[PDB]
């Protein structure tokens, strides 16, 4: 039996459908966005789209519609899932809380019937008398919108028109009247029926029109006063209304298929149209007032407005603004103009929304080589294709960089008393101080009068009474903002040098050996109020103000060199209020007092990189709730900063970290920087809400991103990335990518627009002699939408496309890996490819290519031409294992640095995926699930250990450990199959046992070993073993890992309990949702744990936790199972959050 956990690190992002209506109220224009399992509700404001509610369904979404039953103040929302769970939903809000209530629900799957040949369709009658569904060919399923039909019971009207392409309900008809495009041996036709809910059959409709355009789809029902319907094809647009017929065929739309439309005008006068590219049109229905006074259509007319994101769906909004829902790129908000710009465009971008989908590949890297792990993904497609540099930790937007090495501190200053914003930045160095003046964005080194240049600054900042303060080894110096003059100076009575210092707007405290001095900041005067002598030399000290105090701290926090203690002293008396032993053998290097979420905390960091933090009671100086997190290995400096007006703490270290509070607990998130020794907040005119960051050699000025856990440094390629791998030796990424170029009158191909491969700092084209052996001379037909593939070499620090190698014509580059091979020390980029041609079901041609990137040059090291598409490659004992159509092949790395045939494995339909560990090989077949091989060094061959004889349409595979094999398949299910060492016969041994089955709901594009969360080496209590990240066509990223038996036997029990406690939208049972599901069979979930559900345990209130927790058996590490508590499960789930 087998033990595994699967969790979502990043939600789906790609829009699969969108609509506008009046769901949250009549007066809100809503945009509703469906992303694959995620429903998002937006309000249309003049300023832009505002997100209001998001829901994850236990069900992939396939149909979404808004409608308004008579008497309802606001729309109802119909949703049909891919498992045919149907539901009617109403937005509710109570104060800040928002719920999506299911008024009606029920599964409408028919036990027998072929799912329809053109997606799932559902539509709603304008008067909302009924809902029509097209789930299966030859059957039109009707749901009466009777209020008593709360169970979505439905009946099928047998439809003689088997293949239905698109459907709508017509306006203004006393009987609810269906209008639809269908296909038959005669081509496509538009036909109507008066649907009788009483007779449950099709009475004849008001009209029909045989033989519409053969490419026709996209029926638009046209409202009053016009009535009728518009039919949209690839090449023409036609209007029908009883006997009247009107048609246009603009050459401008013939260039691309329109794939979505939206109603601009309530009366149907204008309609948006959106093509494959994201070209956005306006379709005009021009009115004619007839002689009887009635209104009719005079002519159709199409205008190109400009370009936008690739449209899955379109939405006209308000104030002339439009939303474009994008599945293949970032989604867009754009404003339409009456007059075009100088480019002839009426469309101006207004806002943009991030989309990772489809994630077609990824790899885990350490560019800072710290060992944390960062994920770089192939994301988006076509002109939207983009690398997304994803990483647990907060990014920094660099606005400026200055080569000032040896910085020992950072502080902002406002030299101008008339400015609320910072105009000066101060840098400290050993034996000297330097000051940088800020003039807008320009930064220039300057001399700040009143400051000491020949001494190291330990602290400086703005202080009360319009003054600046500097603290040096010799003295504390008070300097006026104007004219930057020294107004007062304090010196230690024994002339002993200050070694550390901290100061706020009204108080100064300095560390001199074992002595501490407290000064008050008065107008043009520094007053020594008190002094004390500590038992040991002071290693760090702080007096940051807390709460609403006017810069006056009742407390001083310190750390010492000998006892390694942190202490809180009362000011001015320096009376010891609290002493806390940090322990270890390494001194505290920084201490800081701060406020998070209006709660006060003390932080103190050791020279070993360990950070201690405590709740801080201001009135008593007492510390509580002591907790420890190891952030780095080098000395850590703690400083406060501001972001979005919030107060946060930064831990400067070899592993820079931001500290902030959520739900009253401090959350630690890494920062995507190589190293930080010192930093300070900076709020200048050129660098507002910015941070100044210093390391060993450079100063960086930039703005911190939102304090999210996962950041995404987007790099637009304007071409679809396909695969990615990393080469530490050259500090480079290899990225397969692909732009579109139409085979136009250039005879070759012409790009839609420039992309990374065309834009690269250098480029090349595959110069290979292997594929020369045949061509026909007349192949290259005009208008063909060719996909041109490239390998991009990408600098890990700047993400400059250093190089771009274009593959052969039609050569889809399929797989990419970076690894060492043989005894040769070099790290190589290795690509597997295929030549792709329209007619051939299976690739019969491909190659494996080895490159190296050195001295700025990508160079081809080796090639081998292969009998198939190279669908996957992995490193295997320094030999390379590659899967090529129906075979798996093992190449020995020759000392001649080229691959040579050691052996082959067969017995597959198509070995799409490969993974290896030790001498074991896991292979994923196109339909025959997974099999396990052993390598035989003594025979030079493979022995097939065991295989799964169950069918599975594999989408990806991975080895979690030596005996457990993880698989994913095209019906969005995962499974784990396992080798039974207790098998007694060869027939049993040859059979892999199914030991886990799980419906994920997402199509998985890739599995990869690695983790984005830094490993706490020395802490081996982790419930999870191994780490396999995976990505999906909708931009979701997840993680799978093994468990012990007692972890999994705890956790699947926990899942089934949660399945029953948490209520899904549409009231779909989780067990059903997750039940392994295919056209052929359904099976309950085993072997896996639903990590999304497990983490939803933290998204439910304690009363729900208690329902799950009661009577659950937990192996607390003692080996004795006990009833779990909610806090135990929370700790376990928190541990399970931190694995991704």
């Amino acid at each position: 039996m087998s033990y595994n956990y699967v969790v979502t690190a990043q939600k789906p992002t790609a829009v699969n459908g969108c609509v506008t209506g009046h769901f949250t109220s009549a007066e809100d224009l809503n945009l509703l966005i469906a992303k694959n399992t995620r429903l998002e509700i937006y309000v249309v404001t003049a300023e832009g789209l505002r997100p209001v509610k998001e829901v994850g369904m236990y069900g992939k979404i396939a149909v979404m519609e808004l409608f308004r039953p008579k008497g309802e103040s606001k729309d109802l929302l119909f949703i049909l899932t891919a498992k045919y769970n149907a539901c009617i939903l109403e937005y509710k809000q109570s104060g800040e809380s928002i719920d999506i209530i299911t008024r009606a629900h029920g599964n409408v799957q028919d036990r027998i019937g072929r799912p329809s040949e053109t997606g799932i369709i559902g539509i709603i009658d304008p008067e909302c008398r009924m809902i029509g569904l097209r789930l299966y060919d030859g059957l039109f399923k009707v749901i009466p919108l009777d209020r008593d039909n709360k169970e979505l019971k439905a009946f099928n009207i047998r439809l003689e028109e088997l293949h239905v392409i698109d459907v709508k309900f017509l306006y203004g008809c006393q009987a609810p009247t269906i209008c639809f495009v269908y296909q038959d041996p005669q081509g496509r036709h538009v036909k109507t029926y008066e649907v009788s809910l009483r007779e449950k059959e099709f009475n004849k409709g008001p009209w029909k029109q045989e033989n519409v355009e053969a490419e026709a789809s996209m029926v638009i029902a046209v409202p009053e006063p016009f009535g009728g319907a518009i039919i949209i094809g690839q090449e023409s647009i036609t209007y029908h209304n009883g006997d009247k017929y009107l048609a246009i065929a603009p050459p401008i739309i013939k260039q691309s298929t329109i794939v979505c439309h939206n109603r601009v005008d309530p009366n149907g006068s204008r309609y948006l149209l959106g093509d494959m590219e994201g070209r956005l049109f306006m379709l005009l229905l021009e009115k004619e007032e007839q002689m009887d006074g009635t209104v009719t259509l005079k002519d159709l007319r199409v205008e190109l407005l400009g370009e936008t994101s690739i449209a899955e769906c379109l939405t006209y909004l308000d104030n002339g603004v439009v939303f474009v829902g994008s599945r293949l790129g970032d989604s867009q908000l754009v404003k339409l103009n009456v007059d075009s710009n100088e480019q002839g465009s009426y469309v101006v971008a207004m806002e943009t929304f991030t989309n990772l989908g489809p994630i077609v590949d990824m790899c885990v890297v350490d560019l800072e080589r710290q060992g944390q792990g960062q994920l770089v993904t192939c994301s988006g497609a076509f002109k939207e294709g983009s690398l997304r540099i994803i990483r647990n930790g907060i990014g920094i937007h660099e606005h400026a960089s200055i080569d000032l090495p040896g910085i020992k501190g950072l502080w902002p200053l406002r030299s101008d008393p008339n400015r609320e914003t910072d105009d000066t930045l101060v840098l400290s160095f050993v034996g000297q101080t330097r000051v940088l003046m800020l003039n807008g964005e320009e930064v220039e080194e300057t001399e700040l009068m009143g400051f000491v240049d020949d001494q190291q600054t330990f602290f400086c900042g703005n202080v009360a009474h319009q003054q600046l303060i500097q603290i040096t080894s010799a003295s504390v110096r008070l300097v006026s903002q104007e004219p930057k003059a020294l107004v007062s100076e304090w010196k230690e009575p024994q002339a002993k040098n200050i070694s550390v210092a901290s100061c706020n707007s009204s108080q100064v405290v300095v560390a001199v050996g074992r002595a501490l001095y407290y000064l008050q900041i008065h107008p043009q005067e520094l007053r020594q109020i008190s002094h004390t002598e500590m038992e040991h030399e002071v290693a760090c000290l702080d007096i940051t103000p807390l709460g609403d105090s006017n810069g006056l701290s009742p407390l001083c926090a310190i750390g010492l060199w000998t006892d390694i203690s942190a202490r809180i002293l009362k000011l001015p008396s320096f009376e010891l209020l609290h002493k806390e032993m940090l322990g270890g053998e390494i001194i505290p290097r920084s201490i800081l007092m701060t406020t998070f979420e209006s709660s006060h905390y003390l932080l103190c960091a050791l020279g070993d990189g360990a950070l201690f933090y405590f709740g801080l009671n201001i009135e008593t100086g007492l510390l509580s709730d002591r907790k420890k997190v190891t952030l780095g290995t080098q000395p850590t400096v703690l400083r406060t900063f501001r972001s979005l007006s919030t107060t946060n703490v930064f831990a400067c270290s070899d592993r820079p970290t931001v500290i902030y509070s959520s739900n009253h607990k401090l959350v630690f998130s890494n920062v995507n920087l190589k190293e930080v020794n010192y930093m300070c907040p900076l709020n200048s005119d050129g660098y507002p809400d910015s941070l100044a960051l210093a390391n060993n050699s450079t100063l960086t000025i930039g703005t911190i991103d939102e304090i999210q856990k996962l950041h995404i440094r987007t790099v637009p390629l304007y071409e679809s990335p396909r695969k990615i791998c990393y080469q530490e030796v050259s500090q480079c990424f290899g990225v397969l990518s692909s732009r579109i170029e139409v085979q136009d009158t250039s005879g070759g191909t012409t790009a839609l627009r420039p992309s990374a491969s065309t834009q690269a700092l250098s480029s090349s084209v595959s110069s290979s002699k292997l594929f020369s052996s045949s061509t026909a001379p007349h192949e290259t037909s005009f208008g063909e939408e060719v996909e041109v593939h490239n390998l991009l070499i990408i600098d890990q620090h700047t993400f400059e496309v250093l190089h771009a190698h274009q593959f052969l014509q039609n050569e889809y580059a399929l797989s990419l890996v970076s690894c060492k091979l043989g005894k040769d020390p070099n790290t190589y980029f290795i690509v597997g490819t295929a030549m792709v041609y329209p007619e051939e079901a299976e690739p019969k041609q491909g190659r494996i290519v080895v490159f190296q990137y050195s001295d700025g040059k990508l160079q081809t090291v080796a090639e081998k031409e292969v009998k198939g598409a190279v669908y996957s490659m992995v490193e295997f004992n320094g030999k390379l294992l590659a899967s090529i159509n129906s075979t798996v092949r093992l190449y020995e790395w020759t000392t001649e640095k080229e691959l040579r045939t050691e052996c082959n494995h067969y017995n597959n339909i198509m070995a799409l995926y490969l993974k290896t560990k030790g001498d074991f090989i896991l292979v994923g077949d196109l339909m025959r699930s997974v099999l396990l091989l052993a390598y035989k060094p003594m025979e030079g061959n493979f022995e097939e250990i065991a295989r799964d004889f169950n069918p599975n349409w594999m989408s990806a595979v991975e080895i979690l450990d030596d005996d457990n094999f993880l698989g994913a398949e095209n019906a969005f299910n995962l499974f784990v199959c396992q080798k039974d060492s207790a098998a007694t016969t060869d027939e049993e041994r040859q059979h892999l046992q199914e030991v886990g089955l799980f419906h994920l709901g997402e199509f998985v594009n890739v599995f990869c070993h690695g983790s984005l969360v830094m490993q706490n080496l020395g802490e081996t209590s982790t419930p999870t073993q191994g780490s396999v990240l995976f990505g999906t066509v909708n931009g979701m990223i997840g993680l799978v890992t093994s468990l012990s038996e007692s972890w999994y036997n705890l956790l699947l029990d926990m899942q089934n309990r949660l399945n029953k406690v948490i209520k899904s939208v549409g009231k779909i049972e989780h067990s059903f949702w997750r039940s392994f599901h295919t056209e052929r069979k359904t099976e309950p979930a085993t072997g896996f744990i639903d990590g999304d559900l497990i983490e939803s345990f933290l998204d439910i209130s304690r009363p729900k936790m208690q329902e799950v927790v009661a009577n659950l058996q937990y192996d607390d590490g003692s080996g004795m199972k006990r009833e779990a508590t909610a806090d135990d499960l929370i700790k376990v789930v928190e541990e399970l959050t931190r694995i991704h």
Binding site: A14, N16, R111, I112, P115, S116, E117, T118, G119, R327, L328, P358, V360, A381, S720, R722, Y812, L814, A834, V836, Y837, P838, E839, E840, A841, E842, P843, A869, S886, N907, N908, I909, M910, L912, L926, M927, R928, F949, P951, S955, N970, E987, F1003, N1005, V1033, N1034, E1079, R1080, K1081
Partner: protein, 390 residues
């Protein structure tokens, strides 16, 4: 403009979710049909001392029922090889034919009396109704023309038409609720019609195979004097035409390919391909080369026809290539089992193995698992064979 047909387009489009739907269905399953025969390995079942498995079908992806020349009926769990016997339905010898209605709600088999039809509920195999009296001789074939109506052929050349109305089902259910012992519902033929009798042997009027074309609502039928009879089956059984098979002996199996509008028909040596509306020259035939042994069952998986032979070999024929798959690639049935009674002693005194004739074979609902069953070819021998291939 050419068709977008490459699986790499489908794979990349699928990575993009770019309408990787039914447009690629025929490509996906067709590729599999060509590759699968080379990947199959035999797993024999220990059936015990049963005579011969003459009929079988997948009730589900994991479950195969087996009907025997000796009137026992049972399930093989193909995964565990576990046996489980089923009641044998009596009137108000062997189970030489079995059928499923297209909704997979009703199972139809030969009864205790070889003359009488038996019906069971899918998937439970609860008994539905008693054996009839329409045929004066053995029921040699079955075919479901709707989910209430099935047609059955016979060794006397008659064809009984049956309807399991909702009343039959509700009467079986009501009776099974009132009585703890299962008490059957009653049935009678909606019509009884004979085949046209041709110039061939008048004692050999045996109708041994039936297949239902759901598209045209036509019923195909085959006799062992070598004639095909075609019937409309919209609401009642009605003759359309009759015509001679190009091989006119031992035509014991018939299958209909809804994806190719063509019936495949067995014989003593050849598989023949018929559209029954077409003339006799439009009826092309492939020889199994297992000559003298007969084809003993036949089936379709996309453009690939699977041919179970009297020499125990399973052949696979490609419509589009017009040849067998590959030196033809063929599984061959293992030894199964054989009884050593006096009949073997008298006529087969020195034969310890038989090339076990493939009386029945079928694909699971995915097509990756091919169940196979049979026994020795001669008539006097008693000896089952069964084995999954996967």
């Amino acid at each position: 403009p050419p068709v977008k047909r490459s699986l790499v387009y489908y794979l990349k489009n699928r990575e993009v979710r770019l309408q990787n739907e039914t447009s690629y269905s025929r490509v996906l399953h067709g590729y599999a049909a060509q590759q699968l025969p080379s990947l199959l390995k035999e797993r024999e079942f220990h059936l015990g001392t049963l005579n011969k498995v003459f009929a079988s079908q997948w009730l589900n992806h994991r479950q195969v029922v087996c009907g025997t020349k000796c009137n026992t009926l049972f399930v093989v769990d193909v995964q565990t090889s576990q046996i489980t016997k089923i009641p044998i339905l009596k009137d108000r010898c062997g189970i030489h034919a079995i059928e499923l209605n297209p909704s997979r709600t009703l199972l139809a088999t030969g009864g205790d009396n070889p003359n009488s039809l038996a019906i069971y509920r899918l998937p439970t195999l609860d008994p539905v109704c008693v054996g009839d009296d329409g045929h004066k001789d053995w029921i040699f074939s079955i075919a479901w023309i709707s989910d209430t109506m099935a047609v059955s052929g016979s060794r006397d050349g008659s064809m009984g038409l049956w309807e399991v109305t909702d009343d039959v089902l509700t009467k079986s259910d009501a009776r099974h609720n009132v009585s703890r012992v299962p008490v059957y519902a009653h049935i009678t033929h909606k019509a009884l019609k004979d085949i046209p009798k041709e110039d061939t042997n008048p004692d050999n009027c045996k109708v041994r195979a039936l297949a239902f074309n759901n598209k045209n609502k036509e019923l195909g039928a085959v006799s062992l004097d070598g004639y095909f009879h075609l019937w409309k089956a919209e609401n009642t059984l009605s003759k359309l035409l009759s015509t001679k098979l190009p091989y006119c002996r031992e035509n014991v199996c018939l299958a209909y390919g809804s994806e190719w509008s063509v019936y495949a028909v067995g014989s003593q040596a050849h598989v023949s391909f018929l559209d029954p509306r077409q003339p006799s020259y439009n009826v092309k035939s492939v020889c199994s080369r297992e000559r003298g042994s007969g084809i003993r069952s036949v089936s379709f998986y996309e453009h690939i026809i699977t041919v179970g032979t009297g020499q125990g070999s399973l052949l696979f024929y490609d419509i589009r290539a017009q040849r067998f798959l590959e030196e033809n690639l063929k599984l061959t049935t293992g030894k199964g089992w054989l009884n050593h009674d006096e009949t073997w002693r008298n006529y087969f005194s020195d034969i310890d193995f038989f090339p076990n004739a493939v009386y029945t074979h079928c694909y699971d609902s995915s097509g990756t698992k091919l169940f196979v069953a049979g026994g020795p070819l001669p008539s006097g021998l008693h000896g089952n064979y069964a084995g999954l291939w996967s």
